Amino acid sequence: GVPSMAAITSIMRAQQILLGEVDAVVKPYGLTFARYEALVLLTFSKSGELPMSKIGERLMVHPTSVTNTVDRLVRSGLVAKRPNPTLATITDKGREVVEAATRDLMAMDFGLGAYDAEECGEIFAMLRPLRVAAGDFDE
Template sequence: MSRPRPLPQDPIAEAHRQWTAHGWGEVADGMAAVTSLVRAQQIVMARVDEALKPSGLTFSRYELLQLLSFSRTGAVPMAKASERLQVHPTSVTNTVDRLEAAGLVLRVPHPSDRRAILIEITEAGRALVAAATEALNSNVFALPGLAPDRLQALLELLAEFRRAAGDFDAGEDPAHWAPARDRVRSPD
């Protein structure tokens, strides 16, 4: 994967300096944190997009296919997909439309709830998401850009940030961020 040429200076550090110099020092750290998160997201998504390019998938389509591949039956209700992916139901509908047109998922009636529709992954969807996962694992996830101990610290900080923002139940045990190599896989 090609990386862009680094800038001669950190523009966020310069913005922090300017924020402070213009009398906003009390919020300069917050501005730098938010701006750094946004920039980090841009960097990560560029790497993800490059890894997914051969599959023709966007990250949202990849996430939905992976969610389906992780389910016991290969199918989940549309509403549950929306909840699990933390996106509006309309986004799931649009993603399913595109995946269905490509032959990667099917809409099927829910066996016990006539009002619900299941999204079911096809064999073509399974094959594509497996190949895309290999590309992401080797080109993005295996090389996140931080040493394991720093990555662990980042995961804990981001979980703390998301919990404080109300992203998930504040009672959740933070121990779930124990390094993956130290955990035993639990069956679903």
């Protein structure tokens, strides 16, 4: 077809395929993959805590998405919110869940088990310039 059409279709399909697989893995924890990614970020943050604004900056997601995500994590007992002297803090239940979910996701290679490491590395390398332009690799 047209190269741009072929490429965008491929990326769209790959995202749908993989999202289907990883969402199924985290569903038993009351998570979606997006909510899982927010928990992971908190486990790499000082005191398990970030301002909502910084969560969005680090995940490269819109503030309205952060709000919805954090609220649903609180609803599940996995995060607590407080005013910023809003700060989101991972709870001990949240830490237990993300450890378990990560183990489960690792065990199925995030849906890419049928690929080898070379092919996964190619995916990273080829999509990197698009991400650089979006700011993913700058503070």
